[PDB]
Amino acid sequence: GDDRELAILATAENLLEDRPLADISVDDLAKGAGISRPTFYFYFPSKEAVLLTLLDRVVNQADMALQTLAENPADTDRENMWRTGINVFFETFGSHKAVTRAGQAARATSVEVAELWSTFMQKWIAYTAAVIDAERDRGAAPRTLPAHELATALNLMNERTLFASFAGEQPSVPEARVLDTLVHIWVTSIYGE
Amino acid sequence: GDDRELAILATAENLLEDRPLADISVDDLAKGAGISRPTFYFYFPSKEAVLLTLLDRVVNQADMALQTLAENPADTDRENMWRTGINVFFETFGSHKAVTRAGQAARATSVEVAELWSTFMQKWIAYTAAVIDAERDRGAAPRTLPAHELATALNLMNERTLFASFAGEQPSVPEARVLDTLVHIWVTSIYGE
Numbered sequence A, B: 001g002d003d004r005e006l007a008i009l010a011t012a013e014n015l016l017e018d019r020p021l022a023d024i025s026v027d028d029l030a031k032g033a034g035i036s037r038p039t040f041y042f043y044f045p046s047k048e049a050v051l052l053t054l055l056d057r058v059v060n061q062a063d064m065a066l067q068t069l070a071e072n073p074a075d076t077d078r079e080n081m082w083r084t085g086i087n088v089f090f091e092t093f094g095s096h097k098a099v100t101r102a103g104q105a106a107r108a109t110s111v112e113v114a115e116l117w118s119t120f121m122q123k124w125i126a127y128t129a130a131v132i133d134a135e136r137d138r139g140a141a142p143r144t145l146p147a148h149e150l151a152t153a154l155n156l157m158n159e160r161t162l163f164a165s166f167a168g169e170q171p172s173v174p175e176a177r178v179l180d181t182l183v184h185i186w187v188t189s190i191y192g193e
């Protein structure tokens, strides 16, 4: 039951490490999961639905980790607060690079994947803006740009920069440098001038 | 001769305003250019080659405008220097939104488009880093992050943020706010702390 669905998902994630979604067949997923092709279609309508489910799990994992931080403030300086938050995405998506790469690609071809990513980006931007606003209200950050516009650009920077780093794109920031790089830009732009 | 090639390119750019590359046929391009389909294949091997040529023209237009600025420093403050440079990309790609949108999409499917974008991004990042380094050498900017890593993240931010704005993505910064937003983040991260 749920065991076969999890086996399909585990097989898909393992196969996406080696090749793109277009090079993986339903029979590959069925075979790796130890089921027949018709049995696969009982659990998922398509291989694209499998990827959507994998990406949904990863994005909710990051979202739930961010929620945990939001409820449990670590006792540190403001730079460390932003670093701990950015690290949720660095660690969560960096621990699932194949699903990250395949899910970002599927945004062009799947409206459900595009809508999933858009929904969570809006949530993460709204949370970023709310924290910036709280920093301004307590007098720690200056009232410069509209907080929601600043939050939008910073979150889009992280999306593009983290995923370029994980994919080894040229150009990209080395993965071992990308957290420090992003934290610097967030802290200087939120607290500067 | 060159007149027919330009007619194909003009037709392609006009049609990309209304639909994606996948919804445009060679006969559409031939018909719009006033030539036959076989005559089209004398000038371009495919509709994808037409898009590659259009994107090549746009990216070289931006690159040449940046080169013009690099030779002719405007007499202003440091914030205005970065704003004038970012504006080259805002105006050039924003004046060709359809080719911008279609070219970015083709990066996934065309190695020549991916290599074209990568080559110019590397050039623009190297120039950004060189200007940051010159600002540090003259004592105007602090020695914080490695200049090339900072330049990489800032250029990737601009790519993602400008193109989200032009496409009206959710989420995106409004087009009328995106230049101010990017300039703030560049100036604070280059000169801050």
Ligand SMILES: Clc1ccc(Nc2nc(-c3ccccn3)cs2)nc1
Residues within 6 Å of the ligand: A081, A082, A084, A085, A086, A087, A089, A093, A121, A124, A125, A127, A128, A131, A155, A158, A159, A162
């Ligand atoms: Cl891929 C991707 C997509 C969105 C984001 N957004 C982020 N928001 C935060 C954050 C941290 C603390 C408080 C508020 N927000 C850190 S990173 N980051 C990476």
Ligand SMILES: Clc1ccc(Nc2nc(-c3ccccn3)cs2)nc1
Residues within 6 Å of the ligand: B081, B082, B084, B085, B086, B087, B089, B093, B121, B124, B125, B127, B128, B131, B155, B158, B159, B162
């Ligand atoms: Cl889409 C895209 C791609 C790359 C960039 N990079 C940029 N470099 C500059 C710049 C300006 C002055 C001096 C050095 N660099 C401004 S914007 N911007 C938008």
